[PDB]
Each structure stands twice: as C-alpha cells, then as structure tokens.
Design an enzyme around this catalytic site. Structure first.
Site, PDB file in Angstrom:
ATOM      1  N   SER A  44     -43.848 -19.145  -2.125  1.00 12.40           N
ATOM      2  CA  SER A  44     -43.521 -19.991  -0.978  1.00 12.40           C
ATOM      3  C   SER A  44     -43.167 -21.447  -1.283  1.00 12.40           C
ATOM      4  O   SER A  44     -42.742 -22.130  -0.376  1.00 12.40           O
ATOM      5  CB  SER A  44     -44.620 -19.954   0.085  1.00 12.40           C
ATOM      6  OG  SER A  44     -44.531 -18.759   0.833  1.00 12.40           O
ATOM      7  N   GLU A 140     -37.904 -13.102   2.123  1.00 10.06           N
ATOM      8  CA  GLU A 140     -39.296 -12.704   2.248  1.00 10.06           C
ATOM      9  C   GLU A 140     -39.380 -11.275   2.798  1.00 10.06           C
ATOM     10  O   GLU A 140     -38.627 -10.922   3.696  1.00 10.06           O
ATOM     11  CB  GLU A 140     -40.041 -13.619   3.200  1.00 10.06           C
ATOM     12  CG  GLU A 140     -40.216 -15.054   2.712  1.00 10.06           C
ATOM     13  CD  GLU A 140     -41.289 -15.193   1.657  1.00 10.06           C
ATOM     14  OE1 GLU A 140     -41.490 -16.324   1.185  1.00 10.06           O
ATOM     15  OE2 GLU A 140     -41.929 -14.188   1.296  1.00 10.06           O
TER      16      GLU A 140
HETATM   17  K     K Z   1     -46.416 -17.464   2.642  1.00  9.92           K
END
Ligand code: K
Ligand code: K
Ligand code: K
Length: 261
Positions: A44, A140
């Site tokens: 992230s 993601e």
């Molecule tokens: K995350």
C-alpha cells in the site's frame, strides 16, 4: 560501514528478514541507505504515487477532486474500510484519496488507478517526476503478493525516498496539491506502530504504511523535527516465509536508529 549502517544491519540480523532503509536529511542533502538499491514490494505505499498522480491531474482539471465516483458491489476487494460504507452511493476523488491514504482502502486505490487509466498511468506519473525505479503492474489486491524476487509492484528505498521528498517538500506538485498531500499524510490512521513509534515525540510526521504476504511491512514518511530541517524516511521490510507475521516493530526501530544517527 557507518555506525548507523552497523546498527541497521544488526537490527536486520535480529529480525530474520530483509530490511531496506533510505533517509534524506534535507539540511545538506545527506542520505543514509541500507539496501537502498534493492527492490522491495511496495504494497500500500504505492497509494502515495497514485494519489499524487491524481493531484497532478487536478492542477489543470480544477473540478477533479469533487468529481463523484460510483462505488458498486463488484468494486469491493479484500480491504475496504471506507468504501464499504458508500456502496450504491458515490465518493469524490478527494474522499477516495483520503480513504486510500489515511485508511489504506484498497477499493479507493483501484478508483485512483482507474482515474489514471490503469496501473500504467501511475507508473507514467513516476517517470514524469524523474523516478525511473517505481513500477505498478497490478491493481488491488494482487499487487500485494510480495513474491521473493518478483519485480512487479516494487521500488527501491533510494527511489521512493527521493520521490517522497519531491512530492511533499520539493514542487513535483503545485502548492495547493503539495499541501493537500502533506495534510493527508499527517492525518494517517494506520502508522502509530511503524515509523512514528520510533521518533522523538516532539517531531511531527506524515506517513503511509504498507503490508502484504511474506510478512511484508512497510512505511514511508516525511518528518519535521523542531528547529531542524525536515527528513524523509523509507523503511521496507520483508521475510522468508509466505505466511510471516507483520513486524511493524522493525520499522519503528529503524526510525529510532535513523533519528539518533
Ligand atoms: K491496504
Ligand atoms: K495509511
Ligand atoms: K497484522
């Protein structure tokens, strides 16, 4: 080897894993590196590049941050603390940037990637600000696989430290955008056990964490000590076992060693 590098090597040896550190002292542009040119999975921490790229777009698209974006059921991925609150409604790009950065919301990241025309749009922004190292390949949640030796979705500590400096202190963005990014990083909610936990309490900081498989545990920060020029610090960490636990303590201890040295 410097005294700081010896302490970082010792920390790494104690940990069982692989530690990457890059620190920049903006006073004399001195930097301290540990495995500074090795690739690490970003996880992230890549959200900083995606949010900054959207901020760069908003410099010519004045309404961009208030643009509503639909959140549908199918958009939800593995970790969506903010986006799951707004399914079948909308969130603005500002709200999505804030969610990505301050809560590490993966649905929000995917919306930023989509705004930029895919992962290639994030990588292109990196190149446009002189970062030849960063690469975003996947969305993601697959960007978090953190497979040993896989170059996908990686950067180096040296590269990410320089980029973070340019974004938050050095005019890679416009001033309204740079201040917004600094504000977002300062308001992060996920970083208390990472870099921040190793800094003198009188210092202020903004940061973005990352975590993934192989016990990957990351943090990047911009730091303001009192009566001292600011610093930029990147701490990346990853481990030999696919199922390893998070080791945020390693990042805190690395920051302590940097702060002291
Ligand atoms: K995350
Ligand atoms: K975060
Ligand atoms: K955890």
């Amino acid at each position: 080897t410097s005294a700081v590098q010896q302490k970082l090597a010792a920390l790494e040896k104690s940990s069982g894993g692989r530690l990457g550190v890059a620190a920049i002292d903006t006073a004399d542009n001195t930097q301290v590196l540990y495995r500074g040119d090795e690739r690490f999975p970003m996880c992230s921490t890549s959200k900083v590049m995606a949010a900054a790229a959207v901020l760069k777009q908003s410099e010519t698209q004045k309404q961009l941050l208030n643009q509503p974006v639909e959140i549908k059921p199918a958009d939800l991925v593995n970790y969506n603390p903010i986006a799951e609150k707004h399914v079948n409604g909308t969130m603005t790009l500002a709200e999505l940037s804030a969610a990505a950065l301050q809560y590490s919301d993966n649905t929000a990241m995917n919306k930023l990637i989509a705004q930029l025309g895919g992962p290639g749009g994030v990588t292109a922004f990196a190149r446009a600000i002189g970062d030849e190292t960063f690469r975003l390949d996947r969305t993601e949640p697959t960007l978090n696989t953190a497979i040993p030796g896989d170059p996908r979705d990686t950067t180096t500590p040296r590269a990410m430290a320089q980029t973070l400096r340019q974004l938050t202190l050095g005019h890679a963005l416009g001033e309204t955008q740079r201040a917004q990014l600094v504000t977002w990083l300062k308001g992060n909610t996920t970083g208390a056990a990472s870099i921040r936990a190793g800094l003198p309490t009188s210092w202020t900081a903004g940061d973005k964490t990352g975590s993934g498989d192989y016990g990957t545990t990351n943090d990047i920060a911009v730091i303001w000590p009192q009566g001292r020029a600011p610093l930029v610090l990147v701490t990346y960490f990853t481990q030999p076992q696919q199922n390893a636990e998070s080791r945020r303590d390693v990042l805190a201890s690395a920051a302590r060693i940097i702060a002291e040295g």
